[PDB]
């Protein structure tokens with residue numbers, strides 16, 4: 001009935017696509033003269049106020065387990081960490097034999113944790129040598145066949161780099177923004193499991209502040225829920241998929257290192273220095289972390305109540321400790337002010353639940369030669385820190401796992417897991433999606449072009 | 452082994468080499484071709 | 496004000512009045528040293544190709560442009576009455592997506608290529 005093709009430009013149509021995002025950093029702490037391992041000089045300042053646009057009658061489909069933003073964030077974090085350790089001292093001449101002996105002195109019983117080692121080291125002049133001593137943890141030295149012979153644990157895999165002493169490891173919020181022609185969709189559904197149609201879709205200019213916190217078996221300083229404890233998994237039937245838990249209310253954890261350290265500088269070359277622990281003044285005590293018993297019990301009860309819905313109605317829920325493996329996957333590993341902790345989370349996951357001012361002290365261990373990002377051939381030798389360190393944090397999540405069930409029911413045991421850093425950022429980049437705007441369309445009107 | 456027509460071309464060279472530890476040294480050997488070595492002024 | 500992509504759930508009759516909002520948002524202005532330098536070039540090239548395609552037709556600098564191609568290839572099987580008042584632009588792309596490569600060639604041969612030839616032979620006299 002006299003209908004002809006009409007071209008419209010600028011129609012609101014979008015399709016799924018993958019692109020590269022950039023920074024947006026707050027200007028409050030952007031101007032300070034403090035260097036961080038996550039660079040800020042290459043990130044543009046953020047907008048003074050975000051622009052939130054609500055979409056009516058729009059129903060999009062999200063999927064938290066197939067998002068490219070997590071992979072891009074992982075690549076950027078790894079690249080930043082690799083770039084932050086370049087311009088300064090490399091500890092190649094430290095692969096020498098050592099004459100180590102027990103520290104003793106004040107031992108509360110840390111019997112063999114610390115060792116007093118002496119060695120020969122080069123000086124600024126090429127033809128002279130100096131004899132110095134340093135204190136090393138038991139997790140860094142390996143005996144080679146009373147003053148016995150020891151050696152560093154990395155002296156047969158790779159000569160590594162010393163951590164730059166001018167940088168800091170404190171996380172800072174990072175915003176990711178899409179380029180022109182691309183939009184970010186935000187799911188505002190409070191009860192969303194990360195996978196499926198979202199009723200409340202809202203166009204957001206960028207993202208919020210996401211702190212790159214590195215931890216295992218627990219989530220520290222994350223995003224809390226709004227209504228109830230949320231359990232999200234890719235396949236709840238499969239036992240080979242990790243389970244992500246989000247806490248409604250955060251519990252408090254305090255960590256400290258009671259020893260008062262003392263850092264001394266040793267010159268190993270022209271313009272190069274090595275930082276060692278000379279003496280410990282005071283008393284020697286173990287590092288520990290504490291969790292309030294009642295708040296943890298209430299949080300675990302809420303987790304059990306919200307976990308009962310998926311599995312059954314009369315099955316018992318049991319919590320056990322880790323199974324085995326490396327030290328980084330069986331302990332709660334984190335960073336407190338520049339010192340790396342490895343805490344024993346065995347008194348936390350120890351309960352059995354039936355359908356019918358105390359604190360929990362967690363012993364921890366400290367290591368100086370670490371190897372993160374699950375790589376082989378690179379270290380990050382953290383220098384000693386003078387004084388006493390303390391940290392107060394929030395526990396706003398869990399990474400649980402399930403064992404192979406027997407008799408198909410009547411028991412379900414959950415133990416903590418971890419190891420992969422993508423699960424840390426999947427818990428925060430779950431409400432976001434990237435789309436590509438297509439502005440060209442055709443529709444039938446009754447125009448005929450003048451001839 | 453035999454050395455029938457291939458005349459002196461492989462050399463049994465022994466030398467001092469470093470190890471992983473900075474203050475220790477090894478004593479190893481290798482078979483080097485004649486086209487990759489030159490004399491400097493039995494065991495020569 | 497509805498803002499960018501404000502009329503995404505609105506009908507076709509109310510979404511065609513805000514084409515200017517989405518028209519201007521398609522062109523705005525070592526880690527993070529080559530990311531932008533490769534994203535902006537792609538953003539420029541995606542816009543230039545669309546502006547060349549819209550213009551090898553007879554529609555050069557107009558946001559709404561209606562031509563003289565009959566409605567034969569694109570089988571909507573639906574009348575104008577329930578299209579501009581009972582459907583959104585997102586649902587339209589789901590129906591006509593197979594016929595968007597045999598309708599982009601009827602706008603380049605049956606229109607503005609033939610049409611540009613009798614005009615060249617009529618200003619001759």
Ligand SMILES: *[C@@H]1O[C@H](CO)[C@@H](O)[C@H](O)[C@H]1NC(C)=O
Pocket residue numbers: 103104105116118133278279280
């Ligand atoms: C370590 O041994 C040196 C002697 O080589 C000694 O002077 C120093 O006090 C010892 N340090 C501790 C903590 O015992």
Ligand SMILES: *[C@@H]1O[C@H](CO)[C@@H](O)[C@H](O)[C@H]1NC(C)=O
Pocket residue numbers: 097098099118119120131
């Ligand atoms: C350092 O070298 C001297 C020889 O110059 C040696 O007597 C001493 O035992 C060495 N110290 C060690 C291996 O700790």
Ligand SMILES: *[C@@H]1O[C@H](CO)[C@@H](O)[C@H](O)[C@H]1NC(C)=O
Pocket residue numbers: 193195196197233234235236
């Ligand atoms: C998430 O919720 C949706 C309901 O929209 C459901 O279809 C889906 O199975 C849920 N995912 C899991 C892993 O249970």
Ligand SMILES: *[C@@H]1O[C@H](CO)[C@@H](O)[C@H](O)[C@H]1NC(C)=O
Pocket residue numbers: 235237238239
């Ligand atoms: C989820 O796990 C079940 C049980 O192992 C398996 O049969 C299924 O293929 C998995 N994937 C799904 C449902 O997408």
Ligand SMILES: *[C@@H]1O[C@H](CO)[C@@H](O)[C@H](O)[C@H]1NC(C)=O
Pocket residue numbers: 260262281387388
């Ligand atoms: C630790 O030792 C320093 C001196 O090196 C001292 O100033 C400080 O007060 C000590 N800290 C404590 C808690 O005693």
Ligand SMILES: *[C@@H]1O[C@H](CO)[C@@H](O)[C@H](O)[C@H]1NC(C)=O
Pocket residue numbers: 252253254290291292359392
């Ligand atoms: C941690 O320390 C704060 C004081 O800074 C205290 O209020 C809180 O109770 C402590 N947490 C635990 C679990 O003891």
Ligand SMILES: *[C@@H]1O[C@H](CO)[C@@H](O)[C@H](O)[C@H]1NC(C)=O
Pocket residue numbers: 309312313
């Ligand atoms: C479990 O049983 C209770 C009643 O005891 C019921 O309210 C609840 O819906 C049941 N949950 C199921 C069947 O998943």
Ligand SMILES: *[C@@H]1O[C@H](CO)[C@@H](O)[C@H](O)[C@H]1NC(C)=O
Pocket residue numbers: 321322323324330346
């Ligand atoms: C877990 O607890 C058992 C005690 O039942 C203990 O033998 C084992 O060493 C613990 N594992 C870890 C990783 O703490």
Ligand SMILES: *[C@@H]1O[C@H](CO)[C@@H](O)[C@H](O)[C@H]1NC(C)=O
Pocket residue numbers: 327330331344346
């Ligand atoms: C943690 O504690 C358990 C028992 O409390 C102990 O068997 C284990 O050796 C400790 N360390 C690790 C790394 O599991």
Ligand SMILES: *[C@@H]1O[C@H](CO)[C@@H](O)[C@H](O)[C@H]1NC(C)=O
Pocket residue numbers: 321346347350
């Ligand atoms: C769990 O708690 C009980 C009661 O205190 C204790 O006997 C048991 O050893 C604990 N389990 C582990 C693995 O330490």
Ligand SMILES: *[C@@H]1O[C@H](CO)[C@@H](O)[C@H](O)[C@H]1NC(C)=O
Pocket residue numbers: 297298301350351352
């Ligand atoms: C506290 O934890 C214990 C586990 O040792 C559990 O049996 C008990 O039911 C918990 N209390 C409450 C009020 O849930």
Ligand SMILES: *[C@@H]1O[C@H](CO)[C@@H](O)[C@H](O)[C@H]1NC(C)=O
Pocket residue numbers: 221250392393394
């Ligand atoms: C921990 O959570 C509380 C809210 O319960 C919040 O006030 C506090 O700032 C959080 N601590 C952080 C984010 O370090």
Ligand SMILES: *[C@@H]1O[C@H](CO)[C@@H](O)[C@H](O)[C@H]1NC(C)=O
Pocket residue numbers: 465466467478
């Ligand atoms: C290796 O060094 C030793 C002394 O350290 C020397 O006696 C020997 O001749 C050397 N071997 C060579 C040069 O092949």
Ligand SMILES: *[C@@H]1O[C@H](CO)[C@@H](O)[C@H](O)[C@H]1NC(C)=O
Pocket residue numbers: 056057504505506
């Ligand atoms: C959204 O859907 C409701 C339910 O049909 C409708 O009444 C409303 O008009 C729709 N919104 C717009 C902007 O048309």
Ligand SMILES: *[C@@H]1O[C@H](CO)[C@@H](O)[C@H](O)[C@H]1NC(C)=O
Pocket residue numbers: 567568597601
């Ligand atoms: C017009 O519609 C008929 C119906 O099938 C189709 O065969 C023909 O190819 C169409 N014309 C063009 C130019 O596509």
Ligand SMILES: *[C@@H]1O[C@H](CO)[C@@H](O)[C@H](O)[C@H]1NC(C)=O
Pocket residue numbers: 573574576577
């Ligand atoms: C026009 O479209 C309507 C659908 O709204 C349909 O009922 C009617 O039959 C169509 N008219 C013709 C001539 O195809």
